[PDB]
Ligand binder design. Structure first.
Ligand code: DGT
Ligand code: CA
Ligand code: CA
Ligand code: CA
Length: 342
DNA sequence: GGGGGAAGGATTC
DNA sequence: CACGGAATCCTTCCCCC
């Protein structure tokens, strides 16, 4: 009987930038993360649709971006701001439901099984929310309403930007038949490829395959997940998940294997990590490194107690040494991550 | 046989 | 060319009932 409303903010980072600087509207905006290795090195965090239409999306080197739209506005990323803007919007969403699962910086699932009665009011409560967000914060969002969370997310996906969709029970049965598996939340490029080899192009194709051969390919959790959606019996609750890890990774001016060359970067990463922990004490720490060929390697340790800053500094090195010791590749990015809070 | 954690890796958004 | 934060899940190893 459950009704789920999913809210997703439009080209969020770029959009905040435009809210904070209204002149930018209508121009192509590209929020970037400058790695400083060389002039304009780094990547695209995101881009408004003005630039997205032309191929400038999250992940491309800012360099390839400048080649496509040499005259677009290129802003440095400012997480703290986007995060404080997300939060307030997120607090206005609580007015519509206590049952709210903040999935990420720009998404939230609201259980409206109560406050509403039908997709008529659902859809109207969507319009009340999309509009009340625009009023207060000046942010466009796309709403997705369906029987469960996954389908609420798909409804939003098909309706962005600034849209609102309702995939009722009629449509759900047609999506489980027509919807391209790859368009299902959780099926990225690697799981999409693996399922193709199994002849699984639709969620419905998942039913016609021995569960054991499906598990051995994508893992048990994914199988039961995809199987569940195929049978229209996926019905997971909404929970208010809490932070379980805090960390930061930075890029070096140039690759290295030298411990003293990498330290300043690792130490900076720790400082920000701690300034972010803010009152929370972690019992586990992980030094994370991206080797020059973009492979991610990491070494960590769990202590029976909380970690002080001074023990974080001392241990981080020890863990970094293990990495250079156990890997002959040059290091491109270095960072830390604190988990298992007290 | 199997609980449970810890560690390193894998994948997603 | 190619930044960055964090969650879920997998596999192997380990201790030990
Ligand atoms: N640094 C960085 N940030 C990202 C990346 N991908 C997404 N983000 C940020 C940028 C934001 O747009 C936000 C949400 O991204 P989404 O892909 O969910 O949607 P976005 O708002 O980018 O566009 P959309 O309205 O969904 O078409 O989180 C990434 O690859 N790197
Ligand atoms: Ca999103
Ligand atoms: Ca979005
Ligand atoms: Ca996909």
């Amino acid at each position: 009987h459950m009704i789920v409303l999913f809210v997703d903010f439009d080209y969020f980072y770029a959009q905040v930038e435009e809210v904070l600087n209204p002149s930018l509207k209508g121009k192509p905006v590209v929020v970037c993360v400058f790695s400083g290795r060389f002039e304009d090195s780094g990547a695209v965090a995101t881009a408004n649709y003005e630039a997205r239409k032309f191929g400038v999306k999250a992940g491309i080197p800012i360099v390839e971006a400048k080649k496509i739209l040499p005259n677009a506005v290129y802003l440095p990323m400012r997480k703290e701001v986007y995060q404080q803007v997300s939060s307030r919007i997120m607090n206005l969403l609580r007015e519509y439901s206590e049952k709210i699962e903040i999935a990420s910086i720009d998404e939230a699932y609201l259980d409206i099984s109560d406050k509403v009665r039908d997709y008529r009011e659902a859809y109207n409560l969507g319009l009340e929310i999309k509009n009340k967000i625009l009023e207060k914060e000046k942010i466009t969002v796309t709403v997705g309403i369906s029987k469960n969370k996954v389908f609420a997310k798909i409804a939003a996906d098909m309706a962005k930007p600034n849209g609102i969709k309702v995939i009722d029970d009629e449509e759900v049965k047609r999506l489980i038949r027509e919807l391209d598996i790859a368009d299902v939340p959780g099926i990225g490029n690697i799981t999409a490829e693996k399922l193709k080899k199994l002849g699984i192009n639709k969620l419905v194709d998942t039913l016609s395959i021995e569960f054991d051969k499906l598990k051995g390919m994508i893992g048990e959790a994914k199988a039961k997940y995809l199987i569940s959606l195929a049978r229209d019996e996926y019905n997971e609750p909404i929970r208010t998940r809490v932070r379980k890890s805090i960390g930061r990774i930075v890029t070096m001016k140039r690759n290295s294997r030298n411990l003293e060359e990498i330290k300043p970067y690792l130490f900076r990463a720790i400082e920000e990590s701690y300034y972010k922990l803010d009152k929370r004490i972690p019992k586990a720490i992980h030094v994370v490194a991206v080797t020059e060929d973009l492979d991610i390697v990491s070494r960590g340790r769990t202590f029976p107690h909380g970690i002080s800053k001074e023990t974080a500094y001392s241990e981080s090195v020890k863990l970094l040494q293990k990495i250079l010791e156990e890997d002959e590749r040059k290091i491109r990015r270095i960072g830390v991550r604190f988990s298992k809070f007290i």
